[PDB]
Amino acid sequence: GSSGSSGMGKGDPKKPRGKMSSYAFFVQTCREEHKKKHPDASVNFSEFSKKCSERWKTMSAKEKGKFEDMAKADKARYEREMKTYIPPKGETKKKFKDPNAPKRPPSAFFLFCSEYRPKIKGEHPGLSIGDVAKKLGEMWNNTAADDKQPYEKKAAKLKEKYEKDIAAYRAKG
Secondary structure (H helix, E strand, O other): OOOOOOOOOOOOOOOOOOOOOHHHHHHHHHHHHHHHHOOOOOOOHHHHHHHHHHHHHHOOHHHHHHHHHHHHHHHHHOHHHHHHOOOOOOOOOOOOOOOOOOOOOOOHHHHHHHHHHHHHHHHOOOOOHHHHHHHHHHHHHHOOHHHHHHHHHHHHHHHHHHHHHHHHHHOOO
């Protein structure tokens, strides 16, 4: 969530941290290259630090360019981790309905719970529109991916309609 800071600091293993910027990378790009020029060199970490600072600013835009293109490349490869990681729930008035924006079509889960609602609802009268649905919340989770083959494939088609409508809402061209 708009994680302000980023990089070596303090936190937990859960969240895949490891995002470095142009500098963070440049500072290590000069030190590594040095070890090659002077292996038995008595270079200091501090002296090499203050240097990278004024050394990074002095560097002409062109010099920074590469450092920038290489840095951004990481901001992407780093996300790969987040994918494997699943954070808690903390959405703020998101995925909500809006009259201005185009309504989003149903999904596999909705197609299943919707096609099952009229099935279980009749078998179990005691339940109610509310509960009945709350009961499908787990049914889907258990459902095997394969079983979601049709519920998914179909949905995909619908999405198109939305992707076509929204294409206007934003009008980014």
